[PDB]
Amino acid sequence: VFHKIRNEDLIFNESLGQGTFTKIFKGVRREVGDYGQLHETEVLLKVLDKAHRNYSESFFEAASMMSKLSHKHLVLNYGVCVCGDENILVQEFVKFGSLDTYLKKNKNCINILWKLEVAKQLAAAMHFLEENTLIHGNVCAKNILLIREEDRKTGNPPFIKLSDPGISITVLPKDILQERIPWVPPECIENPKNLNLATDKWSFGTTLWEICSGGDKPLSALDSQRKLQFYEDRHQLPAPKAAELANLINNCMDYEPDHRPSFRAIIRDLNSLF
Ligand SMILES: Nc1nc(Nc2ccc(S(N)(=O)=O)cc2)nn1C(=O)c1c(F)cccc1F
């Protein structure tokens, strides 16, 4: 399924951090593009931690899901690097990076319209996946990549893409899932096989919270043990100061998975705001 890329054609540069059992780097690809012309293309290189070769089967499948479909709001995978000793994904390098970084960094510079346009673009991406019964499983602001910033000169909106989900919570050890509360919905902490299209509506709600909360991580002051007890007492996240999306957040984060609204409904809510 995956186009193979030589390592002579890939240079690793800056570290961009770590995923779950992965190391991420900005890189450079030398390729023949359109019209036989030669290109040096900056790419994203994410490496499965050698200490965790276990999950390579999931590691790659997650990217596979994202590449069988094509959508303006989904990050492109270029292929896999031929290493033999390493499992390396070659993907589109989004210029401005993660949304959570951008929110924190630009706390005050974001009005409600900015958040709304981004919420809509994310809902459009999730609706598209919904039509294809494609479970993402790791929706969060960290995995929202900003292609372009808003342009004030032209009054142009920002544009976002959705990265691949990574290793699937169906195989991640317990300690990781609970660290991902409240992005992982309740039913999946009681049983990871409850992973379902309804999961992505809950995580969307959490991501919406991140977007109004200017980069704060919900429940970050609470440790693993409480994050479980937070779900046992069936608590809801606090209303963000930017409170125009609090109702939608709570409707999305419904402890009953069957009651969470479809993303068609969600879009209609988002569209019905000024
Ligand atoms: N595909 C992709 N592109 C980028 N671009 C990027 C990354 C970092 C920066 S910076 N200056 O550190 O803040 C700037 C641009 N990230 N990315 C990812 O999948 C990705 C992700 F989802 C989560 C975390 C890290 C990632 F790398």
Curated annotation (Swiss-Prot):
Belongs to the protein kinase superfamily. Tyr protein kinase family. JAK subfamily. Residues 10-274 form the Protein kinase domain. Possesses 2 protein kinase domains. The second one probably contains the catalytic domain, while the presence of slight differences suggest a different role for protein kinase 1. It is linked to Chromosomal aberrations involving JAK2 are found in both chronic and acute forms of eosinophilic, lymphoblastic and myeloid leukemia. Translocation t(8;9)(p22;p24) with PCM1 links the protein kinase domain of JAK2 to the major portion of PCM1. Translocation t(9;12)(p24;p13) with ETV6. Non-receptor tyrosine kinase involved in various processes such as cell growth, development, differentiation or histone modifications. Mediates essential signaling events in both innate and adaptive immunity. In the cytoplasm, plays a pivotal role in signal transduction via its association with type I receptors such as growth hormone (GHR), prolactin (PRLR), leptin (LEPR), erythropoietin (EPOR), thrombopoietin receptor (MPL/TPOR); or type II receptors including IFN-alpha, IFN-beta, IFN-gamma and multiple interleukins. The chain holds residues 536 to 809 of 1132 of the full protein. Ubiquitously expressed throughout most tissues. It comes from Homo sapiens (Human). The record marks D175, I176 as: Breakpoint for translocation to form PCM1-JAK2 fusion protein. This is Tyrosine-protein kinase JAK2. The gene is JAK2. Autophosphorylated, leading to regulate its activity. Also phosphorylated by TEC. Phosphorylated on tyrosine residues in response to interferon gamma signaling. Phosphorylated on tyrosine residues in response to a signaling cascade that is activated by increased cellular retinol. It comes from the Eukaryota. The modification Phosphotyrosine is found at Y35. It is found in: Endomembrane system; Cytoplasm; Nucleus. Interacts with EPOR, LYN, SIRPA, SH2B1 and TEC. Interacts with IL23R. Interacts with SKB1. Interacts with STAM2. Interacts with IFNGR2 (via intracellular domain). Interacts with LEPR (Isoform B). Interacts with HSP90AB1; promotes functional activation in a heat shock-dependent manner. Interacts with STRA6. Interacts with RHEX; this interaction occurs in a erythropoietin (EPO)-dependent manner. Interacts with ASB2; the interaction targets JAK2 for Notch-induced proteasomal degradation. Interacts with MPL/TPOR.
